Amino acid sequence: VRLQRICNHPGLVEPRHPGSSYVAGPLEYPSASLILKALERDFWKEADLSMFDLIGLENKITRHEAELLS
């Protein structure tokens, strides 16, 4: 019977299966909350250096902004 099964089709005994990757999952690196609070500073001693933002390239240009200046 087994030989007849082989004679019909080998997949009746040893079917081919799909290859696939081994899903490993994430590593879950822990750390403390203060590590993310570094470089945070405080509102009364930080930020609002937008006066030096030459690269802003906002709406309209110096040829019209000179009239706004004076």
């Binding site: 299966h17 799909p18 696939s20 990757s21 081994y22 899903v23 490993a24 590593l27 690196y29």
Partner: protein
């Protein structure tokens, strides 16, 4: 039929049950001491107890240093890793040399992991989302049909987007892998094949198994695969990972933290009975091309507890170490690394051994050769080199076939030796005739 190569005739070390070397077996002849030593190294590797043990095959060119290293690989079998390498490969443009060495160290440590895979497959009967503000899809409801039954499932919105990926609609046959979230639309069901005379769809039968199946398999991986898969992650679903994957991929200088974490989770798998470790062999042929920075790094790498067995090969004499610019040392290797190494001595072959190897290569390449031509090739091999004499067999056979003969004779070998010249003869032409 497979193509014949230089070491294709090598099938093993040809040792007897007592560990001693037979004079001619498994494609190798002679060199009995080195073959016995390599058998001891094979016993060392299969024990799986040791780490970082190093070996150097040292001898003149053409004495079989590469052949014995490959004979070890045949003796070990395909189940053990065997990562061949040549010393010139460390000079990469993307990553430093020591990273290349450490990556090849990790490639030689295998791991056989039992993985449990959840899969869903069936004809999509219906597909309806469910969304609401905390606006966004909470989940999608999907029905699946097979010959043995049907089932209703609720799935993550990531899989829902991976379904809109394949343009999946009702009546289509799909394959979902829940571990990775991978989705494959195999095609449309064969029930709808007769509905049109001509349609662009590709039809497949209905699945015959259960709608939800739980399957166990064994996966062959290395530690380097685990390192690379977590260093440059690829299986995520967040937008940031997708943006990062648009970058051109390059090799990166993987840290020791990641390798330590991978060692930790591998040990957890081993303790849980999920995985089996299969440490293997790294083979660095022509180590003389490594520089002093590479040699010095191998001091620490070979002293690690994780490291594999390493096999080196070199043919140099008292040569200058590369990168040192005045320091001569034996084998082109520093003394300090050479202290950490067991040396296997390889010898030159007698004329009889040359004739025997020539006959083996002849019957390997499918060539009949008379005894007179065989003796003449042996004389040529003694006069010039073994490798030159072996290389004349196929051209002589081609000339014999062109002449209508079914076997090499002496005149064909004479004609080929007249046409093709060896390095010593050509150098004599350069030096004398000029």
């Amino acid at each position: 039929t497979q193509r014949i190569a230089s070491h294709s005739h090598v099938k093993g070390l040809g040792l007897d049950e007592s560990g001693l070397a037979k004079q001619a077996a498994s494609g190798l002849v002679g060199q009995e001491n080195a073959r016995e030593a390599c058998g001891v190294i094979v016993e060392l590797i299969k024990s799986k107890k040791m780490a970082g043990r190093a070996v150097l095959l040292a001898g003149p060119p053409g004495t079989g240093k590469t052949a014995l290293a490959l004979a070890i690989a045949q003796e070990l079998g395909s189940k053990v890793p065997f990562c061949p390498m040549v010393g010139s490969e460390v000079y990469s443009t993307e990553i430093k040399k020591t990273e290349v060495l450490m990556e090849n160290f990790r490639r030689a440590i295998g791991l056989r992991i039992k993985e449990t895979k959840e899969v869903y497959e069936g004809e999509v009967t219906e597909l309806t989302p469910c969304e609401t503000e905390n606006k966004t899809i909470s989940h999608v409801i999907i029905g699946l049909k097979t010959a043995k039954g049907t089932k209703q499932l609720k799935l993550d919105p990531s899989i829902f987007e991976s379904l809109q990926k394949e343009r999946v609609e009702a009546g289509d046959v799909i394959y979902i892998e829940a571990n990775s979230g991978a989705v494959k639309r195999q095609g449309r069901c064969d029930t709808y094949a007769t509905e049109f005379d001509l349609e662009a769809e590709e039809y497949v039968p209905l699945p015959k198994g259960d709608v939800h199946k739980k399957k166990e398999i064994i996966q062959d991986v290395t530690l380097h695969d685990l390192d690379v898969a977590n260093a440059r992650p690829q299986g995520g679903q967040d937008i940031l990972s997708m943006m990062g994957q648009l970058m051109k991929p390059k090799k990166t200088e993987i840290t020791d933290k990641l390798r330590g974490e991978i060692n930790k989770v591998v040990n957890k798998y081993i303790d849980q009975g999920i995985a089996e470790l299969v440490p293997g062999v790294l083979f660095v042929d022509e180590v003389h091309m490594l520089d002093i920075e590479c040699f010095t790094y191998l001091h620490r790498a070979l002293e690690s507890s994780i490291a594999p067995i390493v096999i080196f090969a070199s043919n140099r004499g008292n040569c200058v170490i590369r990168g040192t610019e005045d320091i001569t040392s034996p084998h082109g290797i520093p003394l300090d690394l050479l202290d950490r190494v067991m040396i296997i001595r390889t010898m030159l072959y007698t004329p009889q051994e040359m004739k025997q190897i020539i006959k083996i290569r002849a019957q390997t390449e499918g060539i009949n050769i008379s005894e007179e031509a065989l003796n003449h090739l042996g004389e040529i091999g003694t006069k010039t080199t073994l490798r030159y004499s072996v290389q004349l067999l196929t051209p002589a056979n081609l000339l014999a076939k062109i002449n209508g003969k079914d076997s090499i004779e002496k005149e064909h070998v004479e004609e080929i030796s007249e046409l093709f010249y060896d390095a010593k003869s050509s150098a004599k032409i350069l030096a004398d005739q000029q």
